Amino acid sequence: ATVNQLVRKPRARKVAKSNVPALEACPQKRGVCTRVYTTTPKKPNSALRKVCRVRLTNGFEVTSYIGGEGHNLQEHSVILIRGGRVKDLPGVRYHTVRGALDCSGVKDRKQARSKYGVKRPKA
Amino acid sequence: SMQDPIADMLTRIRNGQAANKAAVTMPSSKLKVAIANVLKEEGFIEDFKVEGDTKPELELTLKYFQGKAVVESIQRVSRPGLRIYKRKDELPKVMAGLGIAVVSTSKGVMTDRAARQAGLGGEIICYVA
Amino acid sequence: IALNKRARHEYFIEEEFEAGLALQGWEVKSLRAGKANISDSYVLLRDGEAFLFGANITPMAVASTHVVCDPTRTRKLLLNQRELDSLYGRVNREGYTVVALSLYWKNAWCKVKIGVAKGKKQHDKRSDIKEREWQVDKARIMKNAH
RNA sequence: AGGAGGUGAGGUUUU
RNA sequence: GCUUACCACUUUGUGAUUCAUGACUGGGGUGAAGUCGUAACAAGGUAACCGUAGGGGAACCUGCGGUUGGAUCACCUCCUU
RNA sequence: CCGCAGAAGAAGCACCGGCUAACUCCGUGCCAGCAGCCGCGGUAAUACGGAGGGUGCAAGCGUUAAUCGGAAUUACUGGGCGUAAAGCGCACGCAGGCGGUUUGUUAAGUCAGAUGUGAAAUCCCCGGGCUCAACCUGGGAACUGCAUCUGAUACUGGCAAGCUUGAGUCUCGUAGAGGGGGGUAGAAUUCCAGGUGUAGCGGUGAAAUGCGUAGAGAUCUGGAGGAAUACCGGUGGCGAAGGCGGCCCCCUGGACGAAGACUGACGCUCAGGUGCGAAAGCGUGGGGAGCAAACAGGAUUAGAUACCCUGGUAGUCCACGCCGUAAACGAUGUCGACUUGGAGGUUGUGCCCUUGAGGCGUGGCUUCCGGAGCUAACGCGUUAAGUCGACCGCCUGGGGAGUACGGCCGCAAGGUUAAAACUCAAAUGAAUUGACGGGGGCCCGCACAAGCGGUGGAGCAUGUGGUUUAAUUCGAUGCAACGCGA
RNA sequence: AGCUAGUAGGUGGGGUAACGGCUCACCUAGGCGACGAUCCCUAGCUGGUCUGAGAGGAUGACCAGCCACACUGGAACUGAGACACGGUCCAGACUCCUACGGGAGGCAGCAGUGGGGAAUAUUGCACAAUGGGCGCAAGCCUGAUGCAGCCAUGCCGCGUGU
Ligand SMILES: [Mg+2]
Ligand SMILES: [Mg+2]
Ligand SMILES: [Mg+2]
Ligand SMILES: [Mg+2]
Ligand SMILES: [Mg+2]
Ligand SMILES: [Mg+2]
Ligand SMILES: [Mg+2]
Ligand SMILES: [Mg+2]
Ligand SMILES: [Mg+2]
Ligand SMILES: [Mg+2]
Ligand SMILES: [Mg+2]
Ligand SMILES: [Mg+2]
Ligand SMILES: [Mg+2]
Ligand SMILES: [Mg+2]
Ligand SMILES: [Mg+2]
């Protein structure tokens, strides 16, 4: 706290890691899911969750959660990851953009169409 | 050890105010009597008297308008560890003109308003309010 | 062994037998390997001798990249006539709920090792219900603010 | 309250 | 045209740093409370903790130095408060 | 710009439990599923999927990516280090930072005036033109900066002079387990030798391992050997810390008290660096009475690697070195000044009728309570955790981790510096109520203790669990279910 | 946590359009460094832009000034002005052509294609205006520039009606 101490060694700021290191300051990443499966969740939300391990173009393999009810995803699928973490899944910090070259929207879903890929129906 | 006489004087003044002492005594110097004069000009104290020749002793008497002390806050500014200097017009005004930021300028010791009127600057000894 | 850790930690299994089930070619050929998701299969009363419910199909890469094979498909349990009405009565007035536990093999048939488990009671929510009531009361009592 | 007068621990760790 | 010196690139030999890989091996975190014992939280039923040495299938145990971040006080008898 | 038919040719997204603006139904029923957090969803979901209806923006709405803000959450303005993360174990000291009082002189830091300059562009202000705007543009200010010339001398500083008020020396004493070396005394324990002497000794909550008719244990004589010094001895003293405890001698350090004389800022704090540094451990050579890691045997327990017992080596001891780690604590770094107090222990000193051990006090060390003040409170409180100044070190959510790697030191065990990846959304500190304690104190109970008579042993009846069938309808499950509903 | 000996300086020559170890011969053994020398990683810098009341933090999108570069590397010439962005020589990789005697090439210019990516443009018109260079000058050309195409990528305005 002494001014002489500050002069002899300036007070430095603590670095802060990004919550999505595998993105490297990029809005989205493309890869293909090395495996698509389901993972047991934590204590309170025992509802089953769907995940896939996908190796990106940067040489890193990450696990991404699948939203919606029913997933149009499998292995060998060209996917898109956007980022975002779920506190209910251990070690999961990614989300898949359903509707990017190998996925359809949620079947029989008429709400949040923009967020779930489906286009607005004519009738 | 004794690295700043002005800070010691301010601390003794504040302690006397806290303890409701009538008079506080200390060793004297030209800077100390100058600060005492600049404080007495605005009447933050009753009077300062320096006695003795071999060991000059300055004793300052504290004003008391009521049970509350006349001087409420007093803070050293230009400490030996960090000196403070401001421009001609950039001197601070404590409590928007209520109180004095004692400043020693080229001509001598004076208050913030006196420094602004004289159009010069110097080092800010202490804020008093 | 597909022990169904949920039904193991809660409401230990009491009664079971050995029988297969009916399925199409889409949701088969992976149960031979073993991959499946049969955790807490919600088997309920069906007119066709309590058709298999709850458990979904394995997420193995057998997909036609549209769906896995069948998001919801009929699965049939196997019983000549022993447990339709008795199962209804037990669920109604006993507390025993039959669920699927494991998938054993005769090397050909993926056997439905359905277990009749007891309905266990929920945890005492008598604290969180009052917490929610206090939260809504706090949200409602913000009226006198202008 | 200044100094010395003594018990009573193999007899239950888990949920 | 011949030649000398200065390089640039290449090659050789020997070093330094970094990355990936590597049979195997060590420790850590999360999940199940599955197995085993109960070490700590009360005097936690042997008060623990810190330093250090040794031992055990492990929580730990024991040997020596230090702390209260421990408990009754005095199962009786005294005399000072 | 003028004419041409007709609204005729042109609206979506997100959200609707609190943060935040918005409520109802249907179906699923910890399932399917939403989400940034809090958190939902176990038959009745305004939270999930759908529907209806509302709200927020609108040719644009939501998710994601990056910066700052809120984060005072790297804090210079503007944090903290006793118990939440944080005072190095302690001391010396260099570079470095700061610096008591007075005079003169320098213009260095600082202040004032003036000049040039800070490209244009861009922000901003006054206006103008594109249907206003977006956009463009004129003028102005600003760009806090930089260098130069002249003055100011209060402060910091360079130079020259001084002073004691700080800091040291000398004179005289005081107290002290301060440090090292060399001798020396006693008690006690162990062992050996000698005498008496018999069936036991030792030990535990209880037993046994262990020793013993060869003569133990027990009691008297002599001798050998090692460690520490009963009482005085004490919240007493000394030392920087660790630490220091019979007595004497030798060498020697440090502290305080009395004024006096002397130098005269010679001072304070320190990175690196140096030295000291409990105990344990390591190397060399001795020594070993007791204690006892590890180990052996006997107990306990369902098992005991341990608390119970008998042995028992290293070590504990000495001399020279290595190690440099402790809850090395006052969890409070060193130094200087100020601020009410009340009771104390020890020392020196003036002093008073020393009338007596007492009276008026004053300085050095230390303990408790306590005012203002401070702190989240507990509590600090003149020996501050209060008021301030000078300097150094340290902390930035927890685990991973004081861990690996790297460097250095060490014979070794290891010590110093010192992370990241990953994971969680808490971790923690003070304090209140209840609960609990094989915690304490106090008072009660066919509860304990004292008596009397019952069940489990036999026969019969009633209900329940298991089995069985067509049902053995069904309800209840310790006290508080079982001749219960009935 | 040490680096450096053409390295620090001087004496003279040479060299440069000019100073200078820029270089040569000799001599002196210093110079830099705890204000971080040397070494490793990263990085175009500035005016500015964003976020902030402020000090501060992030960054260098458009535009302007400066620097460096033109497949990688080395070297020189012309020219006042380069070690040369659509001049020259050479080593290496790649590609292309060849009659197999032997030659050409460097889109980080405008466009455009292959690959990468979450992801970003037409192989247009014109010197019509300004500017650029050449020339008595008319006049030449300019992928600078101006206009045109696509994209809601961002700002602004209007409309779906009363
Ligand atoms: Mg225990
Ligand atoms: Mg801010
Ligand atoms: Mg900040
Ligand atoms: Mg803080
Ligand atoms: Mg702490
Ligand atoms: Mg300390
Ligand atoms: Mg330590
Ligand atoms: Mg022994
Ligand atoms: Mg400490
Ligand atoms: Mg107190
Ligand atoms: Mg952390
Ligand atoms: Mg270590
Ligand atoms: Mg020359
Ligand atoms: Mg770069
Ligand atoms: Mg070209």
Short mmCIF file of N, CA, C and O (backbone and C1' of nucleotides) in Angstrom, two decimals, chain F residues 7 10-11 59-60 67-69 76-78 119-123 131-134 143-144, chain G residues 47-52 54-58 63-65 152 155-161:
data_model
loop_
_atom_site.label_atom_id
_atom_site.label_comp_id
_atom_site.label_asym_id
_atom_site.label_seq_id
_atom_site.Cartn_x
_atom_site.Cartn_y
_atom_site.Cartn_z
P A F 7 -60.29 2.29 -51.85
"O5'" A F 7 -59.06 1.81 -50.96
"C5'" A F 7 -59.13 0.62 -50.18
"C4'" A F 7 -57.84 -0.15 -50.23
"C3'" A F 7 -57.46 -0.87 -48.94
"O3'" A F 7 -56.70 -2.04 -49.27
"C1'" A F 7 -55.81 0.74 -49.44
P A F 10 -50.21 -6.18 -49.79
"O5'" A F 10 -48.67 -6.36 -49.43
"C5'" A F 10 -48.23 -6.42 -48.08
"C4'" A F 10 -46.79 -6.00 -47.96
"C3'" A F 10 -46.37 -5.45 -46.60
"O3'" A F 10 -46.03 -6.47 -45.68
"C1'" A F 10 -45.66 -3.98 -48.31
P A F 11 -47.16 -7.09 -44.71
"O5'" A F 11 -46.32 -7.73 -43.51
"C5'" A F 11 -46.97 -8.17 -42.33
"C4'" A F 11 -45.99 -8.52 -41.24
"C3'" A F 11 -46.54 -8.44 -39.82
"O3'" A F 11 -45.87 -9.39 -39.00
"C1'" A F 11 -44.76 -6.92 -40.04
P A F 59 -38.33 0.21 -37.83
"O5'" A F 59 -39.02 -0.32 -39.16
"C5'" A F 59 -38.25 -0.67 -40.30
"C4'" A F 59 -37.35 -1.85 -40.04
"C3'" A F 59 -36.38 -2.19 -41.16
"O3'" A F 59 -35.16 -2.68 -40.60
"C1'" A F 59 -37.78 -4.05 -40.75
P G F 60 -34.05 -1.65 -40.07
"O5'" G F 60 -34.49 -1.35 -38.57
"C5'" G F 60 -34.02 -2.16 -37.50
"C4'" G F 60 -35.08 -3.11 -37.01
"C3'" G F 60 -34.68 -4.01 -35.86
"O3'" G F 60 -34.79 -3.37 -34.60
"C1'" G F 60 -35.72 -5.30 -37.54
P U F 67 -12.76 -9.50 -23.03
"O5'" U F 67 -12.83 -7.91 -23.11
"C5'" U F 67 -11.72 -7.16 -23.59
"C4'" U F 67 -11.98 -5.68 -23.48
"C3'" U F 67 -12.56 -5.22 -22.15
"O3'" U F 67 -11.58 -5.03 -21.15
"C1'" U F 67 -13.83 -4.30 -23.92
P C F 68 -11.91 -5.35 -19.61
"O5'" C F 68 -12.69 -4.05 -19.12
"C5'" C F 68 -12.08 -2.77 -19.17
"C4'" C F 68 -13.10 -1.66 -19.06
"C3'" C F 68 -14.00 -1.71 -17.84
"O3'" C F 68 -13.39 -1.14 -16.69
"C1'" C F 68 -15.31 -1.32 -19.78
P G F 69 -13.80 -1.63 -15.22
"O5'" G F 69 -15.27 -1.05 -15.01
"C5'" G F 69 -15.51 0.36 -14.95
"C4'" G F 69 -16.98 0.67 -15.06
"C3'" G F 69 -17.88 -0.03 -14.05
"O3'" G F 69 -17.93 0.67 -12.82
"C1'" G F 69 -18.81 -0.23 -16.22
P C F 76 -4.34 2.29 -4.64
"O5'" C F 76 -3.31 3.37 -5.21
"C5'" C F 76 -2.63 4.27 -4.35
"C4'" C F 76 -2.53 5.65 -4.95
"C3'" C F 76 -3.79 6.50 -4.90
"O3'" C F 76 -3.97 7.14 -3.65
"C1'" C F 76 -2.88 6.58 -7.08
P U F 77 -5.31 6.88 -2.80
"O5'" U F 77 -6.40 7.82 -3.48
"C5'" U F 77 -6.37 9.23 -3.29
"C4'" U F 77 -7.31 9.94 -4.23
"C3'" U F 77 -8.78 9.54 -4.15
"O3'" U F 77 -9.46 10.15 -3.07
"C1'" U F 77 -8.10 9.64 -6.42
P G F 78 -10.60 9.34 -2.27
"O5'" G F 78 -10.00 7.87 -2.11
"C5'" G F 78 -10.59 6.93 -1.23
"C4'" G F 78 -10.31 5.50 -1.64
"C3'" G F 78 -8.86 5.20 -2.02
"O3'" G F 78 -8.54 3.86 -1.64
"C1'" G F 78 -10.26 4.74 -3.86
P A F 119 -1.63 17.63 -33.25
"O5'" A F 119 -1.11 17.94 -34.72
"C5'" A F 119 -0.70 19.25 -35.10
"C4'" A F 119 -0.75 19.44 -36.59
"C3'" A F 119 -2.12 19.34 -37.24
"O3'" A F 119 -2.87 20.54 -37.12
"C1'" A F 119 -0.58 18.05 -38.47
P A F 120 -4.35 20.52 -36.52
"O5'" A F 120 -5.26 20.08 -37.75
"C5'" A F 120 -5.24 20.81 -38.97
"C4'" A F 120 -5.52 19.92 -40.15
"C3'" A F 120 -6.82 19.14 -40.11
"O3'" A F 120 -7.95 19.90 -40.50
"C1'" A F 120 -5.08 17.66 -40.63
P A F 121 -9.27 19.91 -39.59
"O5'" A F 121 -9.79 18.40 -39.62
"C5'" A F 121 -10.21 17.80 -40.84
"C4'" A F 121 -10.18 16.30 -40.75
"C3'" A F 121 -11.13 15.65 -39.76
"O3'" A F 121 -12.46 15.55 -40.22
"C1'" A F 121 -8.99 14.73 -39.47
P U F 122 -13.68 16.08 -39.31
"O5'" U F 122 -13.60 15.18 -37.99
"C5'" U F 122 -14.03 13.83 -37.99
"C4'" U F 122 -13.83 13.17 -36.65
"C3'" U F 122 -14.59 13.78 -35.48
"O3'" U F 122 -15.95 13.35 -35.40
"C1'" U F 122 -12.35 13.50 -34.85
P C F 123 -17.05 14.29 -34.69
"O5'" C F 123 -16.59 14.37 -33.17
"C5'" C F 123 -16.71 13.24 -32.31
"C4'" C F 123 -16.53 13.59 -30.86
"C3'" C F 123 -17.39 14.72 -30.31
"O3'" C F 123 -18.73 14.34 -30.04
"C1'" C F 123 -15.17 14.97 -29.54
P U F 131 -33.36 16.61 -49.71
"O5'" U F 131 -34.09 17.44 -48.56
"C5'" U F 131 -34.74 18.67 -48.84
"C4'" U F 131 -35.96 18.85 -47.98
"C3'" U F 131 -35.81 18.44 -46.52
"O3'" U F 131 -35.18 19.43 -45.73
"C1'" U F 131 -37.81 17.53 -47.39
P C F 132 -33.64 19.28 -45.31
"O5'" C F 132 -33.67 19.14 -43.72
"C5'" C F 132 -34.04 20.23 -42.90
"C4'" C F 132 -34.50 19.77 -41.54
"C3'" C F 132 -33.47 19.00 -40.72
"O3'" C F 132 -32.58 19.87 -40.03
"C1'" C F 132 -35.51 17.81 -40.72
P A F 133 -31.58 19.29 -38.91
"O5'" A F 133 -31.30 17.79 -39.35
"C5'" A F 133 -30.50 16.93 -38.56
"C4'" A F 133 -31.14 15.58 -38.39
"C3'" A F 133 -30.21 14.38 -38.54
"O3'" A F 133 -29.49 14.10 -37.35
"C1'" A F 133 -32.18 14.02 -39.81
P A F 134 -27.89 14.25 -37.31
"O5'" A F 134 -27.37 12.93 -38.04
"C5'" A F 134 -27.56 11.65 -37.46
"C4'" A F 134 -27.50 10.55 -38.49
"C3'" A F 134 -26.25 10.52 -39.36
"O3'" A F 134 -25.14 9.92 -38.72
"C1'" A F 134 -28.15 10.31 -40.73
P C F 143 -6.04 22.44 -23.62
"O5'" C F 143 -5.61 21.03 -24.23
"C5'" C F 143 -6.25 19.83 -23.82
"C4'" C F 143 -6.12 18.76 -24.86
"C3'" C F 143 -4.72 18.53 -25.41
"O3'" C F 143 -3.94 17.70 -24.57
"C1'" C F 143 -6.25 18.67 -27.20
P U F 144 -2.43 18.12 -24.18
"O5'" U F 144 -2.56 18.74 -22.72
"C5'" U F 144 -2.85 20.12 -22.54
"C4'" U F 144 -3.46 20.39 -21.18
"C3'" U F 144 -2.65 19.94 -19.98
"O3'" U F 144 -1.63 20.86 -19.63
"C1'" U F 144 -4.89 19.26 -19.72
P G G 47 -1.93 9.23 -29.69
"O5'" G G 47 -2.62 10.11 -30.82
"C5'" G G 47 -2.15 11.42 -31.12
"C4'" G G 47 -2.91 12.04 -32.26
"C3'" G G 47 -4.42 12.10 -32.11
"O3'" G G 47 -4.85 13.18 -31.30
"C1'" G G 47 -3.87 11.31 -34.27
P G G 48 -6.21 13.06 -30.45
"O5'" G G 48 -7.32 12.73 -31.54
"C5'" G G 48 -8.39 11.84 -31.25
"C4'" G G 48 -8.49 10.75 -32.29
"C3'" G G 48 -9.57 9.71 -32.04
"O3'" G G 48 -10.85 10.13 -32.46
"C1'" G G 48 -7.54 8.62 -32.57
P U G 49 -12.10 10.07 -31.45
"O5'" U G 49 -12.52 8.54 -31.45
"C5'" U G 49 -12.95 7.90 -32.64
"C4'" U G 49 -13.19 6.43 -32.42
"C3'" U G 49 -13.98 6.07 -31.17
"O3'" U G 49 -15.38 6.21 -31.34
"C1'" U G 49 -12.06 4.70 -31.30
P C G 50 -16.31 6.62 -30.10
"O5'" C G 50 -16.37 5.30 -29.21
"C5'" C G 50 -16.89 4.09 -29.75
"C4'" C G 50 -16.68 2.94 -28.80
"C3'" C G 50 -17.12 3.17 -27.37
"O3'" C G 50 -18.52 3.03 -27.18
"C1'" C G 50 -14.98 2.18 -27.38
P U G 51 -19.29 3.99 -26.14
"O5'" U G 51 -18.87 3.41 -24.72
"C5'" U G 51 -19.11 2.05 -24.39
"C4'" U G 51 -18.31 1.62 -23.18
"C3'" U G 51 -18.50 2.48 -21.94
"O3'" U G 51 -19.66 2.14 -21.21
"C1'" U G 51 -16.19 2.13 -22.32
P G G 52 -20.72 3.29 -20.81
"O5'" G G 52 -19.80 4.56 -20.52
"C5'" G G 52 -19.92 5.29 -19.31
"C4'" G G 52 -18.77 4.99 -18.38
"C3'" G G 52 -18.35 6.13 -17.46
"O3'" G G 52 -19.17 6.24 -16.31
"C1'" G G 52 -16.44 5.23 -18.49
P G G 54 -15.40 10.59 -17.90
"O5'" G G 54 -14.10 10.93 -17.04
"C5'" G G 54 -13.66 12.26 -16.88
"C4'" G G 54 -12.94 12.44 -15.56
"C3'" G G 54 -11.79 11.48 -15.30
"O3'" G G 54 -10.58 11.92 -15.89
"C1'" G G 54 -13.21 11.56 -13.40
P A G 55 -9.91 11.07 -17.08
"O5'" A G 55 -8.52 10.60 -16.47
"C5'" A G 55 -7.72 11.48 -15.69
"C4'" A G 55 -7.37 10.88 -14.36
"C3'" A G 55 -6.64 9.55 -14.41
"O3'" A G 55 -5.24 9.69 -14.61
"C1'" A G 55 -8.45 9.37 -12.92
P G G 56 -4.45 8.63 -15.52
"O5'" G G 56 -4.89 7.22 -14.92
"C5'" G G 56 -4.99 6.08 -15.75
"C4'" G G 56 -5.99 5.09 -15.21
"C3'" G G 56 -6.22 3.85 -16.07
"O3'" G G 56 -5.23 2.86 -15.87
"C1'" G G 56 -8.30 4.77 -15.43
P G G 57 -4.47 2.22 -17.13
"O5'" G G 57 -5.51 1.14 -17.70
"C5'" G G 57 -5.95 0.07 -16.89
"C4'" G G 57 -7.09 -0.67 -17.55
"C3'" G G 57 -6.88 -1.05 -19.01
"O3'" G G 57 -6.12 -2.24 -19.16
"C1'" G G 57 -9.01 -0.05 -18.76
P A G 58 -5.17 -2.43 -20.44
"O5'" A G 58 -6.19 -2.74 -21.63
"C5'" A G 58 -7.02 -3.89 -21.60
"C4'" A G 58 -7.98 -3.90 -22.77
"C3'" A G 58 -7.36 -3.66 -24.14
"O3'" A G 58 -6.78 -4.82 -24.69
"C1'" A G 58 -9.27 -2.29 -23.88
P C G 63 -9.72 3.12 -45.01
"O5'" C G 63 -9.69 4.65 -44.56
"C5'" C G 63 -10.37 5.65 -45.31
"C4'" C G 63 -10.10 7.03 -44.76
"C3'" C G 63 -8.64 7.44 -44.67
"O3'" C G 63 -8.13 7.92 -45.91
"C1'" C G 63 -9.70 7.92 -42.62
P A G 64 -6.56 7.78 -46.25
"O5'" A G 64 -5.85 8.79 -45.24
"C5'" A G 64 -5.99 10.20 -45.40
"C4'" A G 64 -5.19 10.95 -44.35
"C3'" A G 64 -3.74 10.53 -44.19
"O3'" A G 64 -2.89 11.11 -45.16
"C1'" A G 64 -4.76 10.69 -42.06
P G G 65 -1.51 10.39 -45.56
"O5'" G G 65 -0.56 10.66 -44.32
"C5'" G G 65 -0.15 11.98 -43.98
"C4'" G G 65 0.81 11.98 -42.82
"C3'" G G 65 1.93 10.95 -42.90
"O3'" G G 65 3.01 11.38 -43.71
"C1'" G G 65 0.94 10.86 -40.76
P A G 152 -30.15 -8.48 -47.23
"O5'" A G 152 -30.39 -7.29 -46.19
"C5'" A G 152 -29.73 -6.04 -46.35
"C4'" A G 152 -29.31 -5.48 -45.02
"C3'" A G 152 -28.99 -6.51 -43.94
"O3'" A G 152 -27.67 -7.03 -44.06
"C1'" A G 152 -30.40 -4.83 -43.05
P C G 155 -27.87 0.30 -35.73
"O5'" C G 155 -27.71 1.82 -36.21
"C5'" C G 155 -26.94 2.74 -35.45
"C4'" C G 155 -26.92 4.10 -36.10
"C3'" C G 155 -28.28 4.68 -36.46
"O3'" C G 155 -28.93 5.30 -35.37
"C1'" C G 155 -26.82 4.90 -38.31
P C G 156 -30.53 5.28 -35.26
"O5'" C G 156 -31.00 6.31 -36.38
"C5'" C G 156 -30.60 7.67 -36.34
"C4'" C G 156 -30.94 8.38 -37.62
"C3'" C G 156 -32.40 8.31 -38.05
"O3'" C G 156 -33.23 9.23 -37.35
"C1'" C G 156 -31.01 7.86 -39.90
P G G 157 -34.73 8.82 -36.96
"O5'" G G 157 -35.54 9.03 -38.32
"C5'" G G 157 -35.55 10.29 -38.97
"C4'" G G 157 -36.15 10.20 -40.35
"C3'" G G 157 -37.48 9.46 -40.46
"O3'" G G 157 -38.59 10.25 -40.05
"C1'" G G 157 -36.03 8.76 -42.19
P C G 158 -39.92 9.54 -39.51
"O5'" C G 158 -40.63 9.00 -40.82
"C5'" C G 158 -40.98 9.89 -41.87
"C4'" C G 158 -41.38 9.15 -43.12
"C3'" C G 158 -42.44 8.08 -42.96
"O3'" C G 158 -43.75 8.60 -42.85
"C1'" C G 158 -40.69 7.24 -44.31
P G G 159 -44.83 7.87 -41.92
"O5'" G G 159 -45.36 6.67 -42.83
"C5'" G G 159 -45.89 6.92 -44.11
"C4'" G G 159 -45.94 5.68 -44.96
"C3'" G G 159 -46.68 4.49 -44.38
"O3'" G G 159 -48.08 4.59 -44.51
"C1'" G G 159 -44.63 3.76 -45.30
P U G 160 -49.04 4.26 -43.27
"O5'" U G 160 -49.37 2.71 -43.43
"C5'" U G 160 -50.00 2.21 -44.61
"C4'" U G 160 -49.95 0.70 -44.65
"C3'" U G 160 -50.58 -0.01 -43.46
"O3'" U G 160 -51.98 -0.17 -43.60
"C1'" U G 160 -48.44 -0.93 -43.91
P G G 161 -52.87 -0.62 -42.34
"O5'" G G 161 -52.39 0.34 -41.18
"C5'" G G 161 -53.24 1.37 -40.70
"C4'" G G 161 -52.92 2.70 -41.33
"C3'" G G 161 -54.00 3.76 -41.19
"O3'" G G 161 -53.96 4.42 -39.94
"C1'" G G 161 -53.24 3.70 -43.43
#
